[PDB]
């Protein structure tokens, strides 16, 4: 066999869930090769199918500031984290289908909100009323796993492979946030109710959907430089879609009008209390191992808090 290997620091960081991936572009795909390897296995992918589908999703990613190849690479990571710490959880085509799912949920973003499209009236929303961006990535999924040569689950039988397709299109559809929020308190009620059940399919999916939530908002995870330059390209696009809503007529939400760039801290403060900390808290109780994105979460809290008080600059 050919095994994949990466340099001494890499090989023991990739383990930690802050681990970012470096700006060295051409190093990713072999990056997510070894996590595909390490979680789910040297066999369950032919390596020649698995590099050009790599490469076809790297191409279907636009040069964007935030939601670009990178970000499909580093969500991904995220993913491998958890199935790494989680092992005995998952089954075979949940391993072979959520690091796919990471790899692929953004595909052919161009940096702007389902709002947005619905106020530009672009064709996009006249096909896909709900999750029209989230539709939009599992359809190119789709394309490109159809295209010669990149049927990477072509040693599955018709139902595995629908299964698997299944498993895709819900944790994709998951990455829309607006859904996110009833995700979390029906996981919240029912962890507190004790009726979570892992042996329940429809349970299964909600469980499987905010891992998507919490591998998507993993910029709040990282060491704070990590965090502080990622919000950076966040708010490159946000701002980009407020000045669009501008040139439509409409007042854009005050996250993506640049001219309230000064508020940006009490805006993470909010995001952090509102989304963040629920969604790795409830995690960290389903899947206790999730501990650390948590952690570093409550961390990046105190950090933004700093810098509303003006001990920190950014
Ligand atoms: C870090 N992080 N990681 C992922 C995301 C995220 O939400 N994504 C989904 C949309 O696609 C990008 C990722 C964020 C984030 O910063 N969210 C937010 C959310 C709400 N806000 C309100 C304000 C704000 C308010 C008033 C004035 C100025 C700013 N600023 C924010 C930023
Ligand atoms: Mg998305
Ligand atoms: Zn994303």
């Avoid at 700006?23 to 789910?40: A, D, L």
């Avoid at 052919?108 to 006249?126: C, T, V």
């Avoid at 909010?270 to 961390?299: H, M, S, W």
Wanted: some cysteine; aromatic content about 10%; proline content about 4%.
């Amino acid at each position: 066999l050919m095994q994949f290997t990466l340099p001494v620091r890499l090989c023991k960081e990739i383990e930690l869930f802050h681990f970012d991936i470096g700006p060295f572009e051409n190093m990713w795909p072999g990056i997510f090769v070894y996590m595909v390897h390490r979680s789910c296995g040297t066999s369950c992918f032919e390596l020649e199918k698995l590099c050009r589908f790599i490469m076809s999703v790297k191409k279907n990613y636009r040069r964007v500031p935030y939601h670009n190849w990178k970000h499909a690479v580093t969500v991904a990571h995220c993913m491998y984290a958890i199935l790494q710490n989680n092992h005995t959880l998952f089954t075979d085509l949940e391993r072979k289908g959520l690091l796919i799912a990471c790899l692929c949920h953004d595909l052919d973003h161009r940096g702007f909100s389902n709002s947005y499209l619905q106020k530009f009236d672009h064709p996009l929303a006249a096909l896909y009323s709900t999750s029209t961006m989230e539709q939009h990535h599992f359809s190119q999924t789709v394309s490109i796993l159809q295209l010669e040569g990149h049927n990477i689950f072509s040693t599955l039988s018709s139902s595995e492979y629908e299964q698997v397709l299944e498993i895709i299109r819900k944790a994709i559809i998951a990455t829309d946030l607006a859904l996110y929020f009833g995700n979390r308190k029906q996981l919240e009620e029912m962890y507190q109710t004790g009726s979570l059940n892992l042996n329940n399919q429809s349970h299964r999916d909600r469980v499987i959907g905010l891992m998507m939530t919490a591998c998507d908002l993993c910029s709040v995870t990282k060491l704070w430089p990590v965090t502080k330059l990622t919000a950076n390209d966040i708010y490159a696009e946000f701002w980009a879609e407020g000045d669009e809503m501008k040139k439509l007529g409409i007042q854009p939400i005050p996250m993506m009008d640049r001219d309230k760039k000064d508020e940006v801290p009490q805006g993470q403060l909010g995001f952090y209390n509102a989304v963040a900390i629920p969604c790795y808290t409830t995690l960290t109780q389903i899947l206790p191992p999730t501990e650390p994105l948590l952690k570093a979460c409550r961390d990046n809290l105190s950090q933004w808090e700093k810098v509303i008080r003006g001990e920190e600059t950014a």
